[PDB]
A paper describes a structure:
Given that [name]-1 CA Q50Y was defective, we returned to Chromaclade45 seeking additional lineage-specific changes that occurred along with capsid Y50Q in SIVcpzPtt. This revealed a patch of differences around CA position 120, identifying a deletion of arginine CA 120 in [name]-1(M) and its SIVcpzPtt parent. Inspection of hexamer structures from non-pandemic viruses revealed that the Arg lost from SIVcpzPtt/[name]-1(M) forms a salt bridge between helix 6 and the CypA binding loop in [name]-1(O) and [name]-2 CA helix 6 (Arg 120-Glu 98 in [name]-1(O), Arg 118-Glu 96 in [name]-2). To examine its phenotypic effect, we reversed the deletion in [name]-1(M), restoring the arginine in mutant [name]-1(M) + [name]. The X-ray structure of this [name]-1(M) CA + [name] hexamer mutant at 3.29 Å revealed that adding the arginine reinstated the salt bridge. For example, alteration in capsid surface dynamics mediated by loss of the Arg-Glu salt bridge may influence [name] recruitment and therefore restriction and/or activation of [name] signalling.
[name] capsid has a pivotal role in regulating viral DNA synthesis and shielding viral DNA from cytosolic sensors. Previously reported X-ray structures of [name]-1(M) CA hexamers showed two distinct conformations with respect to a channel at the 6-fold symmetry axis. The beta hairpin structure (BHP) above the channel can assume ‘open’ (His12 forms a salt bridge with Asp51) or ‘closed positions’ (with a bridging water molecule between His12 and Asp51). Inside the channel, 6 positively charged arginines (R18) are hypothesized to mediate electrostatic nucleotide recruitment to fuel encapsidated DNA synthesis.
Residue numbers in the entry:
A (entry chain AAA), B (entry chain AAA), C (entry chain AAA), D (entry chain AAA), E (entry chain AAA), F (entry chain AAA): 1 to 222
The structure:
């Protein structure tokens, strides 16, 4: 990482063992669950591409998945390159070279260089955050593909305490590919459409606009 | 976090693994118990909304509950917006933009920006503390809903050492929705109203005004 | 905490997880034993009332006991207020307000304010240490009430190696309410008054003035 | 290590126990797996040859393997020496001596000297990174030799979920000696050439150009 | 502690949890073994009397032993006071008061004051080291009294590999009360006087002057 | 330790618990294995004699071995003293005294003094490194004496995979007393002289000059 300030002494510190080890254990245990992704970001705070590469390389197993991530990152790199057209020019003394897709994925650049882009002169290029975004995209893809099931098959059981049904439904929701608007839509429509008949009733008896707390409170007594 | 001083070198440090991991384990084990909330605050000291978002996202399971928290935070955001009416104006160079509900919930803002509001120029906006307050509110709601029982059903057993009854009663009390005045009221009235007849007697024999230590000492010998 | 110096850069650092977690585990395991109190102080070094409040709130269970502590702290607060009579006056710009009982118990004050009192201008008010003293007082009370037994019932068994008897006696002593003079008195008088007849003899055979090492050495061979 | 900055206070800090211990445990458990190598680099960030020597010496067992590493490093040293021909000259006061192969492997140099080369005057010699590269080369050799099998024997089983086959194939791939071009070649050709007939079919039905995600999605239903 | 320098920024840092907890566990497991004492010193590096008091108070059990330590420290305090005769005088502004026995045992002094004595003006009083010496003295006493046996009863068994006998003998030696000269004497005389006849012989066959390595090498083959 | 720089703020920090505890556990588990020695050095980076003394004293058991170390260190001290002949002179104000053998073994010197020698004025005396060298010498002696066997008795079993034989042979080699030239000699000669007949053959079939990798590759198929 590169530790921040608005007047303090900035530093380039490499990933700690605590951080590193944490990451290995999360992947080792949790496989491909949505929380893994926030954990990744959390552990990656202020990370440079080298740090990011480090975290990704140290995973053993899930080699299919770690390959899809490489494909995804490659595509992001190509897109970056189309839009950011390279110059045929000599980088003059007193200038830093413009970064290409691969330099941002950390493969074609030095720690120094990555360190420089994030610091720069006046114009700042946060390659760590950019690359981090590419990696989260691929991780999203992977989480989706490894989601055991479709949101439409979340049906509340006959003896299922409403709270537990809500727990399954939103868990499955977090792993879907859809956007905010679709999630909004699925929330109203499918939460009450898929509840058990005993409850489906009471929830209808609150009309079309009531908070989740109201609903859970409503369905508390069976 | 953002580490304090009154003359020292301030810093923007992201959540540590020790902190992060601690939080996951508290939720993992303790579910929705009142101590969780002080733990949350404790781990969140000096946190920015990104940090807060980080801690909340990394929970896996309790997805019903984590959704009620989002609803609650949304409502706090709407209230903030009604009272804080946005301007149609260009943020001029040398100014920072005013934060809206969503920027404070960290969703619509950058770490930079959050970092700036807490530092500012002369007028300080502690978005971390503000947001932290919204989150504790939703957590209160959740703790209440997950409280197994009502304070009025705390009755001292026939062979129940007074100390253990007091332990249940205040545990249940901590999880109630009521205000200070109501808690005061319930303390006097219901502690002695719900004690077992053997004790209920001795406590009456100290009149209407005696400390908890006096009472426990009083009921020490059965 | 607030880390000290006599020329260094002072800092306001919040309780660490290591510290926090340590405290939870000591209470979790040791219940209400005298060592808990030195542990508390040890973990609380340089703590502000917020830190103190944090450590206390995070205990789950022992809710009777955690309530007696609140009562005790309340009484300390009232005493502080009687002696420290508040002014009807406007705190002028360039002044910090005087703290009342509740501000010191951290309930009615900000971290900023607590930070300021300990730093001040010329006149320093160490609210952390003051409050810490109130809390240790209540903890003393609690340790006393949770002491299983009276010092007068510590009697050396017929086959009890003198060393083990001394171990029980002083353990029980640490948990008594009495002052230094009483402890001195109980040491001489009751240590030899309560020893088994075989030993009681040899100790008398050293007269009325001999060190503990002399006594243990004396009673080494049965 | 030597902790970086672009204006901060640089430092020479030796390997921490956390780091050291981590390394021993990775070797202890994982033997000679490809992830070990990224772990090594990760733990070695900013390391000097002494640090590197430290990490390598502390391995117990795998003495065959730790000897091949010495041979490899020796060869790298010889190559460095052929190209970097030493001078017969007195290192004048105000100069630092040029490093030879053995000084870079840390065997013939002081921490001071290693510290100096990485700092220098104007011309920087990163002996830590150079040596680190030699060590990773030998580790590559060792990982190859300890790879249980050839990539050409990765065949998808009759009831083998495509995902698991992809997991084996890329795992085995990571441990091969071949270059990027060969890996590219083996990816297309051998992934579909070695799949089971049920799948081999569907993948052919996507033509010769389709992403890994497309393929896995394609073969999801048996 | 108070962290050192010869030009750096000095600091007053309180005992860490890592340190604290370590100490509790050593006492908890090892009881009263000689290594405990070096551990104590090791953990106490740079400690002030408050720190020292902290470490000692946090022990639970061994209350006999923890009382002998108090007696011993009291005697050291009295000796300090006899030699350091207090003045009847007003400590003038611009002076720090002279410390008495109890201030050094930390009982009668503030952290501030302890902090000051170790810093002072020109004349430095290291109360931490002084007190630490008193505590190690009492710990020596305690280790002696808790030594299970006398050095004169260390006899090599008939089938006892010389190495194991040497291991017992020096272990027992470390726990004896005697000075260097006595230990020297006991080494020569009693090591060979107490060895088994098979060995006692070979050692005599090296004359009266041979190193321990020579002896162990000598007795290697039974 | 004393943490380095080439422009930074130097510090005298005592051994940490992490470090201390690590060392106790390595000795506790690994006994007297060659890796212990690199671990020792690793943990001792930048250590002063006090630190070194600390690490050595905290070992419990292996008292024979810890005594041989004292003998060895004594001899190193005597040698230092013969060559470094002490002056009969008054150390004038503005000078630091020259260190003798015992001051370097840390027994006759203060932390201050040790701190000073390593810093000095212009002429630097690294007593920590000097003493560290004495200790590693004694540890070498001890590792040798505790090596279960002679290198000449390492013979490859009839069904022994060449790799495992190489693992034993070099393990045993690391624990021998011999110099580099002898180790070189033993490598060629005895590795192939002691291999099983099936292999001994193939290795001869590569002539007298082939790398270890070639040999292991050669003997891969039985
Ligand atoms: Cl770790
Ligand atoms: Cl890799
Ligand atoms: Cl429910
Ligand atoms: Cl969702
Ligand atoms: Cl509910
Ligand atoms: Cl962790
Ligand atoms: Cl998320
Ligand atoms: Cl009771
Ligand atoms: Cl309450
Ligand atoms: Cl009670
Ligand atoms: Cl923790
Ligand atoms: Cl609370
Ligand atoms: Cl006894
Ligand atoms: Cl006591
Ligand atoms: Cl005894
Ligand atoms: Cl460790
Ligand atoms: Cl080595
Ligand atoms: Cl699949
Ligand atoms: Cl690969
Ligand atoms: Cl799949
Ligand atoms: Cl701890
Ligand atoms: Cl105490
Ligand atoms: Cl032996
Ligand atoms: Cl000894
Ligand atoms: Cl031996
Ligand atoms: Cl530890
Ligand atoms: Cl010792
Ligand atoms: Cl082999
Ligand atoms: Cl070797
Ligand atoms: Cl092999």
């Amino acid at each position: 990482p590169i530790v921040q300030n608005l007047q303090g002494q900035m530093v380039h510190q490499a990933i700690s063992p605590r951080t590193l080890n944490a990451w290995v254990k999360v992947v080792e245990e949790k496989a491909f669950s949505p929380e893994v992704i926030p954990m990744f970001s959390a552990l990656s705070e202020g990370a440079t591409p080298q740090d990011l590469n480090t975290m990704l390389n140290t995973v053993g197993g899930h080699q299919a998945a770690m390959q899809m991530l490489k494909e995804t990152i490659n595509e992001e790199a190509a897109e970056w390159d189309r839009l950011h057209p390279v110059h045929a020019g000599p980088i003059a003394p007193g200038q830093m070279r413009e970064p290409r897709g691969s330099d941002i994925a950390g493969t074609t650049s030095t720690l120094q260089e990555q360190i420089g882009w994030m610091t720069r002169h006046n114009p700042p290029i946060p390659v760590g955050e950019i690359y981090k975004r590419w990696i989260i995209l691929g991780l999203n893809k992977i989480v989706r593909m490894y989601s055991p099931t479709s949101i439409l098959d979340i049906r509340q059981g006959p003896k299922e305490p409403f709270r537990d049904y809500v727990d399954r439904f939103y868990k499955t929701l977090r792993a879907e590919q859809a956007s905010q608007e679709v999630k909004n839509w699925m929330t109203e429509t499918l939460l009450v459409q898929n509840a058990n008949p005993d409850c489906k009733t009471i929830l209808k008896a609150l009309g079309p606009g009531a908070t989740l707390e109201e609903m859970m409170t409503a369905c508390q007594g069976v």
